[PDB]
């Protein structure tokens, strides 16, 4: 019916896609996802929002997903919409592996998903996916990479970026304290903790509100690991000591 139609996929009089813009607005109200690229590898650091005392942690991670043997991603926005896209990413990666018998390059996987998102914004009459993603991976063409995709379907490679709450503040800080080409995994982790500490206003980084995953190459095989509670606590303790000494 014409009357009840919302007309999601149409242009505004100013040449703007309102549903896309509103979806990006929903992204800003989600947890903070951080991604940093280093010579040794890549890491993803995210702020955990399900911090209730009665929640049980039984899953692999709250916001870190393994898309492939050598790739991973983090999400920000609608949790249910993120679950749909994570499944599509895993299907896309495996379809490429079946066809070519070689792991999908990271850029190709991001482009494939971003084509799905763009289609929803152009035709179909349905609301766009209100989720933004960060990808980390390794491939034989470009080595370690880090990508970010938005609901609009756009994407781009980054050396360090942040999505979610206080993304603008995190980006300005990473711009200040990122050493292009001279970063290591140890230094990247310290920077991630420092940025998360400042971006998570009204918090003290209790180590239950942050999940950190690192991607590295060991003996020719990609290794994706989620830092344990003890490791995160040690990182926070070191950051506290450094801040105290800086006085």
């Amino acid at each position: 019916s014409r009357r009840y139609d919302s007309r999601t996929t149409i242009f505004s009089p100013e040449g703007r896609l309102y549903q896309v813009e509103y979806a990006m607005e929903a992204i800003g109200h989600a947890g903070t996802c951080l991604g940093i690229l280093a010579n040794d590898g890549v890491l993803l650091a995210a702020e955990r929002r399900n911090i209730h005392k009665l929640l049980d942690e039984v899953f692999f991670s709250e916001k870190i997903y393994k898309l492939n043997e050598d790739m991973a991603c983090s999400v920000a926005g609608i949790t249910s919409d993120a679950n749909v896209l994570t499944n599509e990413l895993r299907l896309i990666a495996q379809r490429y592996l079946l066809q070519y018998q070689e792991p999908i390059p990271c850029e190709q996987l991001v482009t494939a998903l971003c084509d799905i998102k763009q289609a929803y914004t152009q035709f179909g009459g349905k609301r766009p996916f209100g989720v933004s993603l960060l990808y980390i991976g390794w491939d034989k063409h470009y080595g370690f990479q880090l990508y970010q995709s938005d609901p609009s379907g756009n994407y781009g490679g980054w050396k360090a970026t942040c999505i979610g709450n206080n993304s603008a503040a995190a980006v300005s800080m990473l711009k200040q304290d990122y050493k292009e080409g001279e970063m290591t995994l140890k230094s990247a982790l310290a920077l991630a903790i420092k940025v998360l500490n400042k971006t998570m206003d009204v918090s003290k980084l209790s180590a239950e509100k942050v999940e950190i995953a690192t991607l590295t190459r060991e003996n020719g095989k990609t290794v994706i690991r989620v830092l344990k509670q003890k490791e995160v606590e040690q990182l926070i303790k070191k950051h506290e000591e450094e801040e105290a000494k800086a006085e």
Binding site: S1, Y4, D5, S6, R7, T8, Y18, Q19, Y22, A23, M24, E25, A26, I27, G28, H29, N50, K53, L54, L55, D56, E57, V58, F59, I78, T79, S80, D81, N83, V84, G125, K126, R127, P128, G130
Partner: protein
């Protein structure tokens, strides 16, 4: 034919009002409580009929999904029945392929996926129900919640429906990680009693327990004994 445009869209502030309104229907629903014990899970809910005419045993609220999974809800009953049917089908499809009972987490993900489709598909409203799923897989109890939006969480103890905020506060003070199933049942009943607003009988509440033996719905005789104690 049917409408092919989504009825749930993004507000200028960046929210899905229909999902928010769906959650409002859940909050107005009847109280439901779930507790994860050390060696089992207990689902309890308030089944209060409007008159003595209603047959208490006619329709149940704590329905089994498989030999080891249970389900309780808070919200609209008709929508609960739809999800109960889909959950049973998904459990059977998994068993056919893998010849093994579906793990509790996998069932929750599939059911949550169905809920997600209804909040994005065209010409349909979201489910006005929130589910509580209990299971026992790999010698371990499981408890999950599934919101109308298709998002699910793993809980040690939670409450839904009317007065759920107060119920959750009660659970936090009273819940202990090291609990036997019998102790958990007492706490679940007490949590319901905190906002029952009436006199509680085995015919006014429904209780289900999941443990190694599987999932079963406690008979009214058993509920009578627990209420007495």
């Amino acid at each position: 034919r049917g409408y092919s445009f989504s009825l749930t869209t993004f507000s200028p502030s960046g929210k899905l009002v229909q999902i928010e309104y769906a959650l409002a229907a859940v909050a107005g629903g009847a109280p439901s409580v779930g507790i994860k014990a050390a060696n089992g899970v207990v689902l309890a809910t308030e089944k209060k009929q409007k008159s003595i005419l209603y047959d208490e045993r006619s329709v149940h609220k704590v329905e089994p999904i498989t030999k080891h999974i249970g389900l309780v809800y808070s919200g609209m009953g008709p929508d609960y029945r739809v999800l109960v049917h889909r959950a049973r089908k998904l459990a059977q499809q998994y068993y056919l392929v893998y010849q093994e009972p579906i793990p509790t987490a996998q069932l929750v993900q599939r059911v949550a996926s169905v809920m997600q489709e209804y909040t994005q598909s065209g010409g349909v409203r979201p489910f006005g129900v929130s589910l509580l799923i209990c299971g026992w897989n790999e010698g371990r109890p499981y408890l999950f919640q599934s919101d109308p939006s298709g998002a699910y969480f793993a809980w040690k103890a939670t409450a839904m429906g009317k007065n759920y905020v107060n119920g959750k506060t009660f659970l936090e003070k009273r819940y202990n990680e090291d609990l036997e199933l019998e102790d958990a049942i007492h706490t679940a009943i007490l949590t319901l009693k905190e906002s029952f607003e009436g006199q509680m009988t085995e015919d006014n509440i429904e209780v289900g327990i999941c443990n190694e033996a599987g999932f079963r719905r406690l008979t009214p005789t058993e509920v009578k004994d627990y209420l007495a104690a």
